[PDB]
Amino acid sequence: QDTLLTLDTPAAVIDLDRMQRNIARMQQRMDAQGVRLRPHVKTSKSVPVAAAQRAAGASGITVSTLKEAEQFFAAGTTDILYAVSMAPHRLPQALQLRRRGCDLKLIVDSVAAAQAIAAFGREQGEAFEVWIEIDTDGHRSGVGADDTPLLLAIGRTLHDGGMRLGGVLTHAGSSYELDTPEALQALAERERAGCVQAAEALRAAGLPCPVVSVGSTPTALAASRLDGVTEVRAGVYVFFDLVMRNIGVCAAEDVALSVLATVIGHQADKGWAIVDAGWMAMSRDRGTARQKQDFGYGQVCDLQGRVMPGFVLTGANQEHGILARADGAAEADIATRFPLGTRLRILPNHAAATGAQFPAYQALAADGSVQTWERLHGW
């Protein structure tokens, strides 16, 4: 039996009970709202994590790279949305996946990218399914929600060009800057309204738009109503993290991903315990620094997963993390509290960034045993 006492450190540990609670909470909310859940696997890139999301009721997946679409298709998942503005040079890759039987959907937000897809699709005999990305909050990519002329020009380029105009999507990722239920509820409504308005504008122009897809984890969990929406995309919620805790959509005790670390030394005068989880284990993500509670490079928990308020990783080098008091004081006799060899678990600022540092997760069962769940690295 591998267990938390036998693993080498650092290790990325998924508490499966916490993961299952998070999976149930999101699926039950999307059912309450009358929409499908299309989880975004870029958080975990792991076949068994996505399998648990599908078993609870999810419908298809969202991926952030074509490498994830290859991985998940090779595992039997065919309903795949690649939710990053399509690069024309990746069209041969996308064509090969569709010819193989993957129902791979692409997105675009410009006439030039829509023309490149439709021209290549006609040449190769492929009616690509393409969704139009809508910018509903100024966060990133997308056609402005009131830019009707651009929306229609892209829609007619796809539809008149022989492609399948499959829907519109938006991602209100500016939700990550918010931290009150009122602000999140309001942004969720702006995301819903803007995505529904773009669908209605396509329809009113006689163009097909069967899918309306919205979501980020915080807006998924905050939306009061989702009229007009057919699916919500969310991914980080499967594990949560401290940035999500600060946004206010979970508690620290809901975070299912932690990094198992061993105490390898101390600086007694400074009240530091040095652990073997540095920034190569945690990642350089410091999202909580700009939030109302800064957790440094992570929140310390004991080996049982009990949060230890007031101890965080105040600093990190590549393979060394510095555990110390959040209150700035030099904990007296730090080595007496955390002897050499003590194992601790660190909750991450950002679950997708920390998970991508590891070749695999250690999925922790109720009996204390672990099973290794590989995940994807690279492109």
Ligand X SMILES: *Cc1c(COP(=O)(O)O)cnc(C)c1O
Contact (CB, 8 A) for 131 and 176 = no
234 lies in the site for ligand X, by CB under 6 A: yes
Give DSSP secondary structure letters for 302-350: -TT--EEEEEEEEEE-SS-EEEEETTS---TTHHHHS-TT-EEEEE-S-
Of residues 161 and 215, the one with the C-beta less far from ligand X: 215
| Residue closest to 329 by CA, chosen among 281, 373, 271 | 271
CB of 322 to a copy of itself, least distance (A): 7
Q: Reduced to 3 states, what is the DSSP secondary structure of residue 106?
A: strand
Distances (CA, A) of 210 to 80, 218, 309: 16, 25, 48
Contact (CB, 8 A) for 118 and 157 = yes
320 lies in the site for a copy of itself, by CB under 8 A: yes
216 lies in the site for ligand X, by CB under 6 A: yes
Among 18, 40, 159, 286, binds ligand X (CB under 6 A): 40
| Residue closest to 267 by CA, chosen among 321, 205, 196 | 321
CB of 218 to ligand X, least distance (A): 6
Of residues 22 and 299, the one with the C-beta less far from ligand X: 22
Among 9, 217, 230, 291, binds ligand X (CB under 6 A): 217
362 lies in the site for a copy of itself, by CB under 8 A: no
The item of a copy of itself, ligand X, none sharing an interface with residue 365, based on CB under 5 to 8 Å by kind, is: none
The interface mask with a copy of itself, positions 250-289, x = CB under 8 A, is ------------x-xxxx--x---x-x--xx--xxxx---
Q: Two tokens at 52? A: 């648990």
Distances (CA, A) of 288 to 89, 106, 183, 248, 282: 36, 33, 18, 12, 13
318 lies in the site for a copy of itself, by CB under 8 A: yes
Window 73 to 112, contacts with ligand X (CB under 6 A): 83
Contacts of 206 (CB under 8 A, 6+ apart): none
Of residues 76 and 341, the one with the C-beta less far from a copy of itself: 341
Q: Which residues lie near a copy of itself (CB under 8 A)?
A: 8-11, 42, 64-65, 84-90, 93, 109-110, 112-113, 116, 135, 138, 140-141, 173, 262, 264-267, 270, 274, 276, 279-280, 283-286, 317-320, 322, 339-341, 350, 352-353, 356-360, 377-379
